[PDB]
């Protein structure tokens, strides 16, 4: 392509990095260093305490939650030698999952999703992972992680993660993220089952809004999952020097999982389209019954009103000079034709 | 040699010859007045207000050594922004934009730029532009424009256009914010018409902005010899701003679509409820019209004469059927 440089933005000083987000509540740096023999964990809020970990033999996992603090991000990037555009991408959350391979580090942007039962939003938060010689730098917007299994594996010496380097740590984080995606798909399964139960019982406008927001959420999920598939493909099919020769089959497993997620998302979309069609048919039927009632009454009272007007005539010479029970005869005739046409419409299975 | 546009009100020539030493400006109506400035070493700016005056634009076309095809493109108005490179000069087409919030209207005017050796020509449609900041900068030395060459003037012109796009985006932003409340709360027909108009304006803006991004990209990636390398980064800056505009209009587009969807899919409920209203009105009043017509159905007999004070009694039984309709619909929850 072209040379990479910090793009200028109107209304800002030339070198400003801006956090492109909405979360500004909390911020802390948790450091988890681990080897086979021992491990040390500590939380803090000063970057000068975590900087000494740039040069360390044992693998380490730095996790900075809260990126509204641009100062700590800039300091970490300039100490770790990270390119300023990668820092700009870390603080920009209006992106899609991506992977960039550099000489001394690899930069990965992924997304964490959260589904709320109430009001049925689909909140998203990017996670940025910079993989270095022996350090994994994680940047998050707010608290709430899906990497607690990885933390437990490090803490209690399960698996083989303590015996491997930072590449396996990056694997553990991505695998936990994909498992979170599976859990999100399960939540969407529950939501679509409940909404399908409700759709044919109460065809209301809130059902319309729920279905449309579900479709939009599925579209956004696909827009996220496809670049995730591309990143996982590039990780094991275009291997940088940072990732060792082994651990590639692990990335292959994650790529297979992403394939599964994409297929599930496409099936989800076709199911919800069918559900919307079913709702439209149900509402059309609900209008149809009211239409049947209207046409029943109209066909009852058009000709009878005509003949009432014809016999409400004020002309000089009408049969209003009547033979015995003439008006009862006329009303009996009108009633019998009314019941005959009622019988016909019953033969039509409307009344 | 045809003017495709619809503006023919006025026409005048604005000339600005400026150097590091002195500057001088003309507001005339003679084509020959701009002739001596084709070979002037110092940077020169020509502004031709009226394209419909085909004679003057053609005359400057032959005198400045431009091919007739770009002249026809200049005369044409309703064409997307584009760039074209020659070994003598460079030709650019860009779009003005004005937005009336009171009428929710969007208007575009085409401007054509021709950067030749140490001089710039510009062609507009109406009077009024967004290059007044550039004129002030040239006049009172508010920048570095008088210390630089003619290719910096093209930068200034395009930058001013991009700033006008930013102002138009601010206006569209406030209109979108109003219309979102107009849709989510109390939807109404005029709000739907406003949404359609905004969709048209946004699609036109996108179809205009993307070619402008391509034009500035082609300008700064493979720079022609007309534009100096020193001024290449400045163009890059302007190019970046275009991306900015791109994203926001895209976002705006999405929002509008969503709004429309929320109104569009909830249309079967409207017909359902209005059919309910008409059906209940008929259900209640057609039988009562029958009762009135048949009890008023003229005869000599009229067996209901006197008949225990007559009409109020039938009113009662009439009222009877009336209520037995409404409660039934209360059973049906219609109304």
């Amino acid at each position: 392509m072209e040379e990479k440089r910090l793009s200028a933005k109107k209304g800002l000083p030339p070198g400003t990095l801006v956090y492109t987000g909405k979360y500004r509540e909390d911020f802390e740096i948790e450091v988890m260093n681990y080897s086979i023999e021992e491990f040390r964990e500590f939380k803090t809020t000063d970057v000068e305490s975590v900087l000494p970990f740039r040069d360390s033999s044992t693998p380490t996992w730095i996790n900075i939650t809260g990126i509204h603090r641009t100062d700590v991000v800039q300091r970490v990037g300039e100490f770790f030698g990270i390119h300023p555009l990668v820092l700009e991408d870390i603080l920009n959350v209006h992106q899609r999952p991506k992977v960039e391979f550099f000489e001394n580090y690899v930069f990965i942007v992924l997304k964490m999703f959260t589904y709320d039962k109430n009001l049925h939003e689909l909140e998203s938060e990017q996670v940025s992972l910079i993989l270095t010689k022996n350090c994994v730098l994680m940047f998050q917007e707010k608290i709430g992680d899906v990497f607690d299994p990885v933390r437990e594996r490090i803490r209690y010496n399960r698996g083989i993660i303590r015996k491997k380097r930072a590449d396996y740590l990056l694997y553990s984080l991505i695998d936990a993220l994909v498992d979170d995606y599976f859990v999100l798909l399960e939540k969407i399964d529950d939501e679509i089952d409940v909404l399908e139960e409700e759709v044919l019982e109460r065809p209301e406008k809130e059902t319309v809004q729920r279905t449309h927001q579900l479709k939009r959420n599925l579209v956004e999920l696909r827009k996220t999952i496809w670049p995730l598939r591309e990143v996982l493909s590039s990780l094991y099919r275009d291997v940088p020097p940072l990732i060792e020769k082994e651990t590639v089959p692990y990335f292959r497993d994650v790529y297979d999982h992403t394939i599964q997620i994409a297929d599930t998302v496409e099936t989800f979309r076709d199911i919800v389209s069918g559900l919307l069609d079913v709702y439209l048919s149900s509402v059309s039927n609900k209008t149809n019954e009211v239409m049947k009632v209207l046409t029943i009454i109209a066909t009852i009272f058009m000709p009878l009103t005509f003949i009432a007007g014809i016999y409400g005539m004020n002309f000089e010479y009408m049969p209003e000079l009547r033979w015995k029970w003439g008006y009862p005869v006329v009303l009996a005739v009108m009633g019998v034709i009314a019941v005959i046409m009622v019988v016909y419409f019953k033969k039509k299975k409307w009344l | 040699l045809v003017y495709t546009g619809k503006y023919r009100e006025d026409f005048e020539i604005e000339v600005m010859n400026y150097s590091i030493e002195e500057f001088r400006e003309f507001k005339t109506t003679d084509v020959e007045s701009v002739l001596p400035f084709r070979d002037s070493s110092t940077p020169t700016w020509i502004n031709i207000t009226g394209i419909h005056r085909t004679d003057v634009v053609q005359r400057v076309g032959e005198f400045f050594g431009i091919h007739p095809l770009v002249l026809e493109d200049i005369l044409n108005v309703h064409q997307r922004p584009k760039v074209e490179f020659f070994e003598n000069y460079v030709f650019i087409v860009l779009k003005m934009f004005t937005y009336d919030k009171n009428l929710h209207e969007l208007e575009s005017e085409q401007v054509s730029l021709i950067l030749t050796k140490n001089c710039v020509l510009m062609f507009q449609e109406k009077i009024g532009d967004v290059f007044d900041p550039v004129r002030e900068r040239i006049r009172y030395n508010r920048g570095i424009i008088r210390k630089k060459r003619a290719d910096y003037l093209l930068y200034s012109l395009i930058d001013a256009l991009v700033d006008d796009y930013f102002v138009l985006l601010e206006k569209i932003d406030d209109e979108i914010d109003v219309l979102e409340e107009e849709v989510l709360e109390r939807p109404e027909k005029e709000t739907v018409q406003r949404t359609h108009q905004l969709k048209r304006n946004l699609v036109e803006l996108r179809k205009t902005i993307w070619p402008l991004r391509e034009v500035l990209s082609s300008l700064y990636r493979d720079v022609p010899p007309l534009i100096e390398k020193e001024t290449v980064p400045y163009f890059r800056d302007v190019y970046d701003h275009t991306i900015q505009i791109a994203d926001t209009v895209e976002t705006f587009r999405d929002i509008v679509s969503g709004l429309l969807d929320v109104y569009l899919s909830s249309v079967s409920n409207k017909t359902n409820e209005v059919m309910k209203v008409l059906t209940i009105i008929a259900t209640i009043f057609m039988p009562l019209t029958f009762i009135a017509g048949i009890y008023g159905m003229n005869f000599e007999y009229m067996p209901e004469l006197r008949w225990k004070w007559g009409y109020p009694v039938v009113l009662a039984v009439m009222g009877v059927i009336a209520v037995i309709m409404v409660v039934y619909f209360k059973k049906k929850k219609w109304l």
Epitope: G11, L12, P13, P14, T20 | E170, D173, D174, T248
Partner: antibody
Framework: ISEVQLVESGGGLVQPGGSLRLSCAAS????????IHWVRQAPGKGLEWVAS????????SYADSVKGRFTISADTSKNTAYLQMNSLRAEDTAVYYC???????????????????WGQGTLVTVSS | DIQMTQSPSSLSASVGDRVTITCRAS??????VAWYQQKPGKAPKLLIY???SLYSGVPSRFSGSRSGTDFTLTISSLQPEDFATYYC?????????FGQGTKVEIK
């Protein structure tokens, strides 16, 4: 370490037409990473922004009422922001505050800044 | 300069009442509006930014809304520590401006 705090000094009585420099020292952040603003509140009147600085780029901005005489500078070595006021008249008697702002995101083309922390405010009087 | 006109200027209410203050900009600003409060003799405290977003640490009672060029701050459940002077600010341009304040006093 510690907490964000801006302490400003240098304000005092000055004769009309004179000049003086007001300094603002930070503690809790590097001055270059964020933008530093000066806000002037006349005695018994509302706030009136005067100047801004981004030390990392020197993109100084001045209000129209004080442009041409006030200058704003920032040095990272001392972590200080200075406002030098020359040609000071009797309308410039007020209390001055040294605020720190952060940029936030609204739209792609739209950016806005909001001031997290404020100083104490130094009283600058210009009379007799 | 983009002028912000804030109304009213001498609002008064008791504890538990609802307070609304609206400032309008002479020129369109793309939701880059902040609301501050100032107690007598102290520095202003940031309350609202982005015209809707709530600053961290302030009580949840304060709220902000935008309608076109109008921006309204609302105090729902007023408390005896909300009696200060509230100011608008627009950061749409480099030349940022302020409103002339709105004192909320006792009744």
């Amino acid at each position: 370490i510690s907490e964000v705090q801006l302490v400003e000094s240098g304000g005092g009585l000055v004769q009309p037409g004179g000049s003086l420099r007001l300094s603002c020292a930070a503690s809790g952040f590097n001055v270059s990473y964020y933008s530093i603003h000066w806000v002037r509140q006349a005695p018994g009147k509302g706030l009136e922004w005067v100047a801004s600085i981004s030390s990392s780029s020197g993109s100084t901005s001045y209000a129209d009422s004080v442009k041409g005489r006030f200058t704003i500078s920032a040095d990272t070595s001392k972590n200080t922001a200075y406002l030098q006021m020359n040609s000071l008249r009797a309308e410039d008697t007020a209390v001055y505050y040294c605020a720190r702002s952060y940029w936030y995101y609204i739209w792609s083309y739209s950016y806005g800044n909001a001031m997290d922390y404020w100083g104490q405010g130094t009283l600058v009087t210009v009379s007799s | 300069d983009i002028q912000m006109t804030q109304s009213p200027s001498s609002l008064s209410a008791s504890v538990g009442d609802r307070v609304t203050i609206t400032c309008r900009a002479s020129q369109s600003v793309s939701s880059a509006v902040a609301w501050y409060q100032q107690k007598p003799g102290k520095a202003p405290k940031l309350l609202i930014y982005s015209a809707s977003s709530l600053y961290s640490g302030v009580p949840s009672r304060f709220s902000g809304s935008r309608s076109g060029t109008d921006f309204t701050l609302t105090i729902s459940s007023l408390q005896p520590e909300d009696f200060a002077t509230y100011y608008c600010q627009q950061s749409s341009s480099s030349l940022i401006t302020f409103g002339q304040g709105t004192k909320v006093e006792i009744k």
